[PDB]
């Protein structure tokens, strides 16, 4: 496929134009009716909203400016918006609008009613290998796309993968995403998904995303992650030992792929070798995978979330609701000028 190579070069050109001249201020708060909280965090939350003029539903991420500054997450938050407004791929949640007011930053994303892979995985227990492979292929293509733009994702986990109406994956949460050529050092991610080099503070590159994919595939197929414990420190100890045990039901091909992704030695890890992503795409475990058909979304999904209207929130957990405050005074104006 010289196809992929020319798709990616054209993709980079579109990305670079938007990266260099980002869109800003494309809606305002009173154009949306807020319906229900879909998730929370230490400096913000995500709400289901309805856009009054179209009637469309969106997921609106609301960030408290003062809290973002206090917790020293300015660069990460600016990274998120700048990257989101510039990318475009079948398996990435789309940013539809963004704006800010006196108190908050807002990113209005497409709403994916099927809920997080997390909920479905815990409920079902584990996914069959073809089911896990279907999702894994989507992540492979998405990381190929992101890494080609010099982006590192850094927060792969089932909680950040939404299942759409066609049963396909939509990756959300670009809060730790960064455009970087060369090494970076920020200790971020989720404990169970951190690569050894992050934990050991040595500097790391995009190979950490491929390690995380190994953890994700293991967790989808097993129903539990390869390294778990009640405290992060004990999890880290297991991760850096790199000893992995596999369930009895894992196929030989799956175990071999995972030995190569969950390789503690950076320089031997699939995705990070001479042939790059092709080592993964060409692996026996993916022999049945039609990569083009996946990209084109022509493969029949193994699972479709039950759907009862746009606006249905049954696939999401209940959260405690709270006011959206907008101060009469502008907060942190200079810090977020480019947002």
């Amino acid at each position: 496929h010289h196809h992929v190579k020319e798709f990616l070069a054209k993709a980079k050109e579109d990305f670079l134009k938007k990266w260099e001249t980002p869109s800003q201020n494309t809606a305002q708060l009173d154009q949306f009716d807020r319906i229900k909280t879909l998730g929370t965090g230490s400096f913000g939350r995500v709400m289901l909203v309805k856009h009054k003029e179209s009637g469309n539903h969106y997921a609106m991420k609301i960030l408290d400016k003062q809290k973002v500054v206090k917790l020293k997450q300015i660069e990460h938050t600016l990274n998120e918006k700048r990257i989101l407004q510039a990318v475009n791929f079948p398996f990435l949640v789309k940013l539809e609008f963004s704006f800010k007011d006196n108190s908050n930053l807002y990113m209005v994303m497409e709403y994916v009613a099927g809920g997080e892979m997390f909920s479905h995985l815990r409920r079902i227990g584990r996914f069959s290998e073809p089911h896990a492979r279907f999702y894994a292929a989507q992540i492979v293509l998405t990381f190929e796309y992101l890494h080609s733009l010099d982006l590192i994702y850094r927060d792969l986990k089932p909680e950040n993968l939404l299942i759409d109406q066609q049963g396909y994956i939509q990756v959300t949460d670009f809060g730790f995403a960064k455009r970087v050529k060369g090494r970076t050092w920020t200790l971020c991610g989720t404990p169970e998904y951190l690569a050894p080099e992050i934990i050991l503070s040595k500097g790391y590159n995009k190979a950490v995303d491929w390690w995380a994919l190994g953890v994700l595939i293991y967790e989808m197929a097993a129903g539990y992650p390869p390294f778990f414990a009640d405290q992060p420190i004990q999890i880290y100890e297991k991760i850096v030992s790199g000893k992995v045990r596999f369930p009895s039901h894992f196929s030989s091909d799956l175990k071999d792929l995972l030995r190569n992704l969950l390789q503690v030695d950076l320089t031997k890890r699939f995705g990070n070798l001479k042939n790059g992503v092709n080592d993964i795409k060409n692996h026996k475990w993916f022999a049945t995978t039609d990569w083009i058909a996946i990209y084109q979304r022509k493969v029949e999904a193994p699972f479709i979330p039950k759907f009862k209207g746009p606006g249905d929130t049954s696939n999401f957990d209940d959260y405690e609701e709270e006011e959206i405050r907008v101060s009469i005074n502008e907060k942190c104006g200079k810090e977020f000028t480019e947002f």
Binding site: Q73, E159, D173, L187, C188, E192, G223, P225, A229, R245
Partner: peptide
């Protein structure tokens, strides 16, 4: 079993991201 140990553990719910 490993599964039973996981399910009895404190980390079966949605996992918070960290930065540090």
């Amino acid at each position: 079993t490993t599964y039973a140990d996981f399910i009895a553990s404190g980390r079966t719910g949605r996992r918070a991201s960290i930065h540090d």
